[PDB]
Ligand binder design. Structure first.
Ligand SMILES: [Zn+2]
Length: 381
């Protein structure tokens, strides 16, 4: 319904649906309880706005009993410390995390407005995960990571490789800076990315180019609106004369599609830049356009959470308090409409009273299989 889950709804969820055993095993890195759980901080966020840090749990039974008793709207996972938080604390390890959310893509989408989301603009997030995954796998050699829907229109990545868990804050900042190519999110300005591109950017550009026509020019088409083209297409260009000529042209000939404007840029540039210097201008326009492909489609991380081993991040399978969606793990097929809603799970448990019979169970199965694979890598040979 329009209202999010009630307190008694949350009580039912933690009692009968939340997968405490698998989340415990994922964070403990072993089948016997160890200090990777006993010394790990969890924070609880209450419906009142209260926020309690430095909880810690010692077994799946204790994690479940404390969460059920507190009944928080969500809880968050922090670092593994040298002493148990519930009892000066030095952080030793924590999964490396990233957060991507639909906000910074809003200027280029037309399918949805405000807090809306749909499978079309979700492609911005699917691409963000694709490019981030390529860097994590190919450049950092990480093998154990999973993305989790954050409940409305974003996702979180949890990387559990032992190397990633042991990174220091300096190292985490260096990983973040490696992936966070678009540093300045402002669209009223041209990126002027450093040339020649670093091989990661060249690689990312080749991955993203085939999606630009189909997503940006055609599906979203944000530049058919002449004021939007002035606001976010023109600023990406490098030459004041080109920009003015295009402005006059689009004034004289209104509502040309994004595809038509995209080609108009080349046509007008070809007429403006002439003579043996022109090859230089051709290159600069191409580079501006490549940079704009990255401005529209390259992952725009919400950077802060990645940078420090102590930072807390919402646990997978928490309930979003406004949408009532479960924050489920994401596979290739996911879009937000596929996330189960708690009220729907409650209605299901009425006819078939076991979690294993609900729409939550495939996501729990995906997560359990993931946890299995991580534990196997943990042992090594
Ligand atoms: Zn949409």
């Amino acid at each position: 319904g329009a209202n999010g889950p009630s307190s008694s709804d949350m009580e039912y969820y933690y009692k009968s649906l939340y997968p405490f055993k698998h989340i415990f095993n994922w964070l403990n890195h072993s089948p016997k309880p160890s200090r990777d759980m006993i010394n790990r901080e969890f924070a609880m966020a209450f419906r009142s706005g209260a926020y309690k840090r430095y909880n810690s749990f010692n077994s799946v039974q204790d994690f479940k009993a404390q969460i059920e008793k507190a009944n928080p709207d969500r809880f968050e996972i922090g670092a593994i410390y040298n002493k148990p938080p519930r009892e000066e604390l030095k952080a030793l390890e924590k999964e490396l995390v990233f957060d991507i959310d639909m906000d910074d893509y809003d200027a280029f989408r037309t399918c949805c407005s405000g807090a809306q989301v749909c499978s079309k603009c979700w492609k911005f997030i699917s691409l963000a995960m694709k490019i981030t995954n390529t860097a994590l796998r190919e450049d950092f050699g990480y093998k154990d990571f999973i993305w989790v829907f954050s409940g409305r229109r974003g996702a979180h990545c949890w990387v559990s490789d032992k190397r990633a868990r042991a990174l220091t804050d300096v190292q985490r900042r260096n990983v973040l800076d490696y992936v966070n190519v678009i540093r300045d999110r402002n669209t009223d300005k041209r990126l002027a990315l450093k040339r020649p591109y670093h091989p990661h950017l060249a690689r990312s550009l080749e991955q993203l180019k085939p999606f630009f026509v189909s997503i940006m020019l055609e599906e979203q088409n944000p530049w058919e609106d002449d004021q939007h083209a002035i606001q976010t297409l023109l600023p990406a260009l490098y030459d004041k004369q080109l920009i003015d000529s295009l402005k006059k042209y689009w004034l004289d000939n209104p509502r040309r599609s994004s595809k038509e404007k995209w080609n108009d840029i080349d046509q007008i540039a070809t007429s403006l830049f002439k003579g043996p210097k022109q090859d230089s201008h051709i290159i600069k326009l191409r580079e501006c356009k490549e940079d704009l492909v990255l401005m529209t489609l390259y992952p725009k991380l919400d950077v802060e959470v990645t940078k420090q081993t102590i930072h807390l991040l919402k646990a997978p399978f928490c309930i979003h308090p406004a949408t009532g969606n479960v924050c489920v793990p994401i596979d290739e097929s996911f879009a937000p409409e596929k996330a189960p809603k708690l009220i729907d799970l409650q209605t299901e448990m009425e006819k078939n009273n076991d979690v294993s019979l609900t729409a939550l169970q495939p996501f729990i199965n995906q997560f359990q299989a993931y946890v299995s694979s991580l534990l196997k890598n943990e042992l090594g040979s």
